Each structure stands twice: as structure tokens, then as C-alpha cells.
Amino acid sequence: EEKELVAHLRSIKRYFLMDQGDFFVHFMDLAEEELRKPVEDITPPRLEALLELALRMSTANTDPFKDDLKIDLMPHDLITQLLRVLAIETKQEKAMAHADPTELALSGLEAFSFDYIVKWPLSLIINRKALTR
């Protein structure tokens, strides 16, 4: 009740699990050109503005927890993130986690991640391990 555990999980499903598929479709349709830019060429403020504009202009505006949705710029590209994840179950997890970010200017698609601000005690559920997974 007080930490709205089920509500937090439903919010994660809507946003982190991309349950609101029309919102993500619209956002990617609008943002592909920016995500097509080289990682060095991406303006973080521009990506943030596009994120907030897709959120407010899509049915994601109807999500009561939509304000908990944050933009996360992954330190690794999608390919490098994938390599890290593939290493996660391997002894290479530390090696891929410590693998320097790919010098290849990752497309915004490869750098794109969500963040979610969880306060205590609700942060007890979305832990850093849980948030990372």
C-alpha cells in the first residue's frame, strides 16, 4: 500500500518492459534520426527533450508513474552492452563490465536506456541489481 509494490511493478512493465508499445513506436519513429547520430554527436539535452515530448505526446501521458521514467545513456553500446550481458553469466562479466566503451560512435539506439528513480523504501524493491537487470 505505502510503497505501491504492485504499482511499481506495473509501471516497470509499462515502461521498462515496453508494455506501452504504441508509445515506444511513436518515440522511436520521432527519435530515430537523433539515435542515428554518432554517440559523440548526440545532444543529451535534445534526447531528453525528445523523450519527454514522446512521453507527454503519447498515451504514456496517461501513466501515473510516467514521471518516474528517466532517460539513461548506457556507457556501452547495445552491442557492447550485449557483450557485457553475455559475459555476465561468464567469468568475463568483470572483463566485459571493465571493457572500455567501444570507440565506435554508438548510435543512440545502441546507447539508449531507461532509468527509474526509486526512493526508499520503494528502492528496496527496484534494487541496483534489479534495476541493472
Binding site: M18, D19, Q20, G21, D22, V25, T59
Partner: peptide, 8 residues
């Protein structure tokens, strides 16, 4: 009925 797939 928006969902995960076939949204377009």
C-alpha cells in the same frame, strides 16, 4: 487495443 506488437 494498443499492445506490445503489431502496433502499426
Amino acid at each position: 487495443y494498443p499492445g506490445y506488437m503489431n502496433n502499426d
